[PDB]
Amino acid sequence: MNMLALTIILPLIGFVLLAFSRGRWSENVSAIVGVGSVGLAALVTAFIGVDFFANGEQTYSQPLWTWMSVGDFNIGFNLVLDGLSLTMLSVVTGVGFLIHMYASWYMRGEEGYSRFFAYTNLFIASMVVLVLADNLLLMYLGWEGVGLCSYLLIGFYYTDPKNGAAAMKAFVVTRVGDVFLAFALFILYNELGTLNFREMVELAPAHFADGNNMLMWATLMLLGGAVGKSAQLPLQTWLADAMAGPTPVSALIHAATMVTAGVYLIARTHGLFLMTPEVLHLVGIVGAVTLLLAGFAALVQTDIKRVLAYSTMSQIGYMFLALGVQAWDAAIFHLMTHAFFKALLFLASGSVILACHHEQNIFKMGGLRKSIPLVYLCFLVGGAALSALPLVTAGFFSKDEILAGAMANGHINLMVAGLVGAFMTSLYTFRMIFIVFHGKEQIHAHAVKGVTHSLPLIVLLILSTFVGALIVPPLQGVLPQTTELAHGSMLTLEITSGVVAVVGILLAAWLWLGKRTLVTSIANSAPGRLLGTWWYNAWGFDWLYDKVFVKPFLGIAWLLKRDPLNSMMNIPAVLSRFAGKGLLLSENGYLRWYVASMSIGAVVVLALLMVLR
Amino acid sequence: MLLPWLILIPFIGGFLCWQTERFGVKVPRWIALITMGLTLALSLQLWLQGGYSLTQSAGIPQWQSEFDMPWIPRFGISIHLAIDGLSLLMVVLTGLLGVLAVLCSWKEIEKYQGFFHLNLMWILGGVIGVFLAIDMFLFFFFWEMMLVPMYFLIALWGHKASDGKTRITAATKFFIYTQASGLVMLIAILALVFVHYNATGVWTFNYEELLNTPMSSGVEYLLMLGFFIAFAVKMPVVPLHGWLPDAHSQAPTAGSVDLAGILLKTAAYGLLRFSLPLFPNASAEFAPIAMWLGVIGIFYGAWMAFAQTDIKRLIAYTSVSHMGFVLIAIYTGSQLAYQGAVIQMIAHGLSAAGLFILCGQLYERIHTRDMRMMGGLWSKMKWLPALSLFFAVATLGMPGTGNFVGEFMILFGSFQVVPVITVISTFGLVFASVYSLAMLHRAYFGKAKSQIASQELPGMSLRELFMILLLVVLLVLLGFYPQPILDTSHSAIGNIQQWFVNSVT
Ligand SMILES: CCCCCCCCCCCCCCCCCC(=O)OC[C@H](COP(=O)(O)OCCN)OC(=O)CCCCCCCCCCCCCCCCC
Ligand SMILES: CCCCCCCCCCCCCCCCCC(=O)OC[C@H](COP(=O)(O)OCCN)OC(=O)CCCCCCCCCCCCCCCCC
């Protein structure tokens, strides 16, 4: 576990080498540096994991140097591994290696093959610092890092201005969450003067004994940071547009990393949310609302990537609901399972798009099940895991645990939201599947094959089945245990969940398989055209934000374009010039006036002398 | 003492630069480089011999070195110089930016280039004197003398594309803003000298003696405002900033004047070295107004930068937004905010320098600074576009770039004193992201918006790469290991912070 830093140094070295290459290296050499860098980091993670379980799962700390020291403000560049970190490090470096390997095949022949891997390497390093940091300020160096790398990869195709707009929106919306996160860091230090996760939860109880009023503000501001990176209400308007970057990026910044940071944060700072129960419950409510709102939006999307974007929002919602119902172990379990099927679905979606000549509309495609078979199977296994098909898929075990925890803790209303979301998940997930692969061919896809493409796909496919549910995250010791549901009550939930999941898929088949007449009629119905438009635009949060923030800002920019305050400070000079011209009017060359001027002056001087005598 | 030579070497080198053009128009530049190199070496020697890291605050005044020589005995005015962790750090930055100011104007080998370098060396000599002067008259003299060389560099060696009329208009506006503001400060220095004599009976211009002058609340406030007006014009503090964008736009295109006379924080140091210590109670009661002026500059500067079209004027307004955070910090009385202000003053100098130097290099290739005539320059150049992205990432304050350390330290300290102001100020980080990305997208990304931007441009030279990469390494090191810089300014900033707080109580 002494090699904990190598999990950051290796990816960071890969970035510098690929950045200074400036595209001079060959694609093969560039891929070896990009995939090998993350690959070696994953190998180090494996060796670290082996030593962690060998030493009895004891938390390990690796102090590197003191970052900032000004009095009691002592921030340290120190790393820590305890189990929650190991789980996250494994997902980041493991699933991160597979995506890098797949990306090697996807970006073949594209400009910036080296720059892409350079940025993905920096993203990995930033995410590793985020997960290994022992303090909130070092976590910030890594929280902001992943945001930059996302901006750099969402707009990788810089030639298209639309891709740049999507990248800027992501950075701005996420940075508004980072400002909220900062507030929490500012409050916690003013109140505890530590910022170290362990010291903070140890010194918090005594300081907030008189009143936790300031602790509630910190936890609320911690939730603000989480809803930004995790794309949860009210900062979820950036995920769908972020689907402008190369498909491999989508897999990394969704399943693997980035959107999981908010969950890790609330999980790492659980000891503080527990002292603020009302804010902790709000985490659950936010997840429930997002999972429901995002499901409807995904059901009406026509772009394959956007359906997978809103699904990530719903799936991150379940993990947020799990944290609010105090099912900490279930949330991390679902983060890991989600990292498998969602990466599979995104990587598979890339294969479909490339096979369909860059086509991305679910319609305009069809009958691909025969042309691309392995990709179709990946979608089936990934879609079943997302819809939580009973027993066969890992998603079933991870989601049921979330629903069980809510019921075990008395959050019935939230559990019900999860159940209805599960039905919606099946419908939106198989609607796309039954429209893209089942039906009549319309594009004639070109077979996509070769290792570097199939290997990552197959490994994620196995991990997306029940086999992934066997990878129990080591959490006892870091996170509290969840209240256990009674066996009889647990069986009822497991059966209900399965029936809801299956019924969803059956209805999806009957609706989007064959002539698709009923769905067309509902879609063309006046209510259908209205609700469909509303959901397609994600309930209109984007429109509202444009009218409340973007439009006002641009208006004020136009108003101040000519620096009004500078023009105000130019009045002293306009008056001066005017006065000068008026005074020069007395400079008429007429001598008789000059003589009269002295006469007037004499009268004034003598008059003043007499009135001031 | 060597303090006197940190000001003389620059001045002597300037005279040599002019007298050596006779040996060729390619000689003055080497004399200038050696001159600034020697000053920088002397500054580093003082750093390695002062043990600043092990100096504990003993209370103002606390100097590692000092020099005094009679100058005008009749008025008790002398050449009094003194160094401290704060002053030392500002002198070494002047040396570094001075060497870069010489290197940036290296391909300029026209006639009368000797006078150009003479003016450049004298601007730097005056800046170093401002950081070393502890005699109030010497401080003012250096404050006002450095403006004359700058006026002739912006008016005679200014933007090659601008007409003589536009360049002179800008130089006159800069001089009138700055010299007039400086005169308001002389009125306050003279009033303080007389108030001291009347209260005590001594006639002194020494800061050390004028430190505790018994004065009323009204006079202390008026004296404080007199110094602030001078430090508000050079910071700048809105609404006394109009001169900045114009001067930057019409200054030598290479960026020499920008780095030498506009990127050294002589006003922030002045507020920390004289205004806060000399007028502790007045500064405390003016804190609310000062802090709110800073918040306005943060948002006003950000909005103004977003709407600029000219890339150099965009960078100029970003400086007004960034300096607002330093003003808020100076009026908090918190060591954390003061230490962060020192880091931001150094970081902004390095980050702004890179942007200004890169802007000049870009002009040399596309012969335009209008972003509306650029685009897709990432696919037409080899280094400039990527390096400009780095400096903008640092400008928005990305952790790991040194600008973050200063900005966040200011907020952490400011929050403990003024929470509401800190909250509104932090939202400035979102506005920074808007103008920072706007510039990169409007110039290097997208498609070419003009023919000049649609052709492969010449690549950056080794000289250009070295100076820009040096700034990159320094910013990253300051971002990951800022302790060595914090340990040098701790004693000086501690002395100032204690004085202010203890005097107010
Ligand atoms: C001796 C002391 C050592 C310490 C100091 C030295 C370290 C500094 C090295 C890294 C910082 C600067 C980054 C590189 C600058 C320019 C290099 C370059 O040419 O890279 C080009 C690269 C893509 O190249 P290409 O596709 O060819 O397009 C460019 C034009 N051709 O495009 C790019 O890479 C774009 C350049 C900027 C990219 C983002 C900037 C990163 C900012 C750093 C913040 C760190 C935060 C995250 C850290 C988390 C992990 C700790
Ligand atoms: C206490 C107050 C707050 C703090 C203040 C701090 C110091 C501020 C100092 C500056 C005050 C505002 C000056 C506003 C104008 C700045 C530039 C200037 O003086 O004139 C520029 C103007 C441009 O025109 P021109 O040069 O002919 O170019 C071609 C046509 N555009 O040229 C002209 O045509 C103008 C002709 C007259 C120029 C000189 C007279 C203007 C200034 C008069 C004094 C104002 C008060 C100063 C008091 C001392 C400082 C407090």
* Residue B378 CA, closest ligand 1 atom number: 30
Q: How many residues does chain B have?
A: 505
- The set of residues, in sequence order, having a beta carbon less than 8 Å from that of A38 and lying 6+ positions away, is A10, A11, A14, A93, A96, A97, A100, A120, A121, A124
B187 Cβ closer than 6 Å to some ligand 2 atom: no
**CB contact (8 A) between residue A19 and residue B386:** yes
Task: Tell me whether residue A606 is exposed, middle or buried, using C-beta atoms within 10 angstroms of its C-beta: 0 to 12, 13 to 18, 19 or more.
Answer: exposed
Q: CB A49: neighbour CB atoms within 10 A?
A: 17
| The two structure tokens encoding residue A558 | 């136009």
Q: Is the peptide bond before A161 cis (omega within 30 degrees of 0)?
A: no
Task: Indicate if the alpha-carbon torsion angle A381, A385, A390, A392 is positive or negative.
Answer: positive
The answer to whether the CB of A44 falls within 8 A of the CB of A79 is no
The secondary structure of residue B295, as a DSSP letter, is H
Best substitution site from A22, A120, A141, A149 to test ligand 1's pocket, by max atoms within 8 Å of Cβ?
A: A22
Ligand 2 neighbour A159 (Cβ under 6 A): no
What is the rounded CA–CA span in Å between residue B259 and residue B357? 9
Q: Is A193 exposed, middle or buried (0-12, 13-18, 19+ CB in 10 A)?
A: middle
For atom 15 of ligand 1, the residue with the nearest CA is B387
Written as one letter, the residue type at A605 is V
The residue whose CA has the least distance to atom 3 of ligand 1 is B473
Is the CA virtual torsion A266, A267, A273, A278 positive or negative?
A: positive
CB contact B172 to A (< 8 Å)? no
- Is the CB of residue A22 below 6 angstroms from any atom belonging to ligand 1? yes
Rounded CA gap, B146 and B160, in Å? Answer: 23
Euclidean distance between CA atoms A79 and B190, whole angstroms: 57
Q: Which of B412, B426, B431 to mutate to test the interface with A (most CBs of A within 10 A)?
A: B412
Number of H helices, E strands in chain B: 22, 4
On the question of a cis peptide bond just before residue A480, with omega within 30 degrees of 0, the verdict is: no
**CATH number of residue A572's parent domain:** 1.20.5.2700
**CA–CA separation, B305 and B245 (whole Å):** 10
Cα angle: B487, vertex B488, B489; to 5 degrees: 100
Q: What are phi and psi of A245, to 5 degrees?
A: -75, 170
What whole-number distance in Å separates Cα of residue A221 and Cα of residue A207?
19
For A184, phi and psi rounded to 5 degrees? -55, -45
Distance A105 CA to ligand 1 centre (A): 24
- Contact at CB, A71 and B405, closer than 8 angstroms: no
Per the CB < 8 A criterion, the answer to whether A332 and A248 are in contact is no
Alpha-carbon distance of B85 to B343, in angstroms, equals 12
Looking from the CA of B487 toward its CB, the CA atoms found within 13 Å total: 15
Give yes or no for A549 touching B (CB within 8 A).
Answer: no
Which of A320, A267, A265 is closest to A290 using CA atoms? Answer: A320
Cβ-count burial of B107 within 10 angstroms (0-12 exposed, 13-18 middle, 19+ buried)?
Answer: exposed
**Ligand sitting nearest the alpha carbon of A568:** 2
Give Cβ neighbours of residue A612 (< 8 Å, ≥ 6 apart).
Answer: none
Residue A149's closest CA among A180, A173, A115?
A115
A450, with CB counted inside 10 A (0-12, 13-18, 19+), is exposed
Give the largest Cα separation in chain B, rounded.
Answer: 73
Determine contact, residues B60/B497, Cβ cutoff 8 Å.
no
Number of the ligand closest to the Cα of B475: 1
Chain A contacts of B181, Cβ < 8 Å? none
Residue A300 Cα to ligand 1 midpoint, Å, equals 40
Ligand 2 pocket, residue A580 CB under 6 Å: no
Closest CB to B303: pick one of A144, A164, A557: A557
Asked if A171 is an interface residue toward chain B (Cβ–Cβ < 8 A), one would say yes
Task: For residue A581, give its domain range.
Answer: 545-611
Enumerate residues 301 to 320 of chain B having a beta carbon within 8 A of any beta carbon in chain A: 303-304, 306-307
Backbone angles phi, psi at A57, to 5 degrees: 55, 35
Other CB atoms within 10 A of residue A63 CB: 11
Contact A148 B416 (CB under 8 A): no
Distance of CA B336 to the CA centre of its chain: 21
> B408 to chain A: which residues are within 8 Å by CB?
137, 140, 182
Cβ contact B242–A145 (<8 Å): no
Instruction: Determine whether the shortest distance from the Cβ of B229 to ligand 2 is under 6 A.
Output: yes
CB-neighbour burial class of residue A498 (10 A; exposed 0-12, middle 13-18, buried 19+):
middle
Angle among Cα B285, B290, B292 to the nearest 5 degrees reads 115
Q: Is the peptide bond before A234 cis (omega within 30 degrees of 0)?
A: yes
Which positions 90-149 of B are in contact with A (Cβ < 8 Å)? none
Which method, experimentally, gave rise to this model? cryo-EM
| Contact present, B501 and B417 (Cβ < 8 Å) | no
Tokens of A91: 């997902």
Say yes or no: CB of residue A115 within 6 Å of ligand 1.
yes
Closest CA of chain B from A228, distance in Å: 13
Residue B240 Cβ < 6 Å to ligand 2: yes
Of A121, A92, A124, A101, the C-alpha closest to A19 is: A121
Whether ligand 2 lies within 6 angstroms of the CB of A576 is answered as yes
Q: Tell whether A526 is within 8 A of chain B (Cβ).
A: no
Q: Give the distance from residue A357's alpha carbon to the nearest chain B alpha carbon, in angstroms.
A: 23
Contact B426 A144 (CB under 8 A): no
Cα atoms in the 13 Å half-sphere on the side-chain side of A209:
5
What number of other Cβ atoms are within 10 A of residue A376's Cβ?
Answer: 20
Q: Which domain holds residue B249?
A: 1-504
CA of A261 to the centre of ligand 1 (A): 24
Q: Measured between CB atoms, does B473 come within 8 Å of chain A? A: no
- B406 contact A CB<8A: no
Dihedral angle of Cα A100, A106, A111, A116, to the nearest 10 degrees:
-20
Q: Which residues pair with A69 in a beta bridge?
A: A74
Residue A366 is encoded by which pair of tokens?
A: 């069809």
**Strand-strand pairing, B70-72 and B81-83:** unpaired
Backbone gaps in chain A, preceding residues (C–N over 2.5 A): none
**Residue B382: nearest ligand to its CA?**
1
Any ligand 2 atom below 6 A from CB of B233: yes
Smallest Cβ–Cβ distance between A172 and the set B393, B408, B434 belongs to: B434
Give SS3 for A80. strand
- Residue B304, min C-alpha distance to chain A (Å): 6
What is the count of structural domains for chain B? 1
* Partners of B83 in beta bridges: B65
Residue nearest ligand 1's atom 19 by CA? A20
Is the CB of B498 inside a 6 Å radius of any atom of ligand 2? no
d(CA B123, CA A176): 41
Ligand 1: residue whose CA is nearest its atom 45: B400
Three-state DSSP state, A72: coil
Q: What is the dihedral of CA A74, B484, B6, B261, to 10 degrees?
A: -60
CA–CA distances in Å: residue A515 to residues A518, A529, B17, B435, B437: 9, 20, 87, 51, 48
Phi and psi based region of residue B112 (left: phi greater than 0; alpha: psi -120 to 50; beta: remaining): left
Length of chain A: 613
- Is A43 buried (19+), middle (13-18) or exposed (0-12) by CB count in 10 A? middle
- Collect all residues of chain B within an 8 Å Cβ-Cβ radius of residue A159: 376, 379, 446-447
CB spacing of B416 vs A164 below 8 angstroms? no
Question: Is residue A69 within a helix (H) or strand (E), and if so which, with residue range?
Answer: strand A60-70
Name A96's bridge partners: none
Indicate whether residue A112 lines ligand 1 (CB < 6 A).
yes
Is the minimum distance from the CB of A129 to ligand 1 under 6 angstroms?
A: yes
Answer whether A550 touches B (CB < 8 Å).
no
Cβ–Cβ under 8 Å, residues A348 and A381: no
DSSP bridge pairs for B70: B78
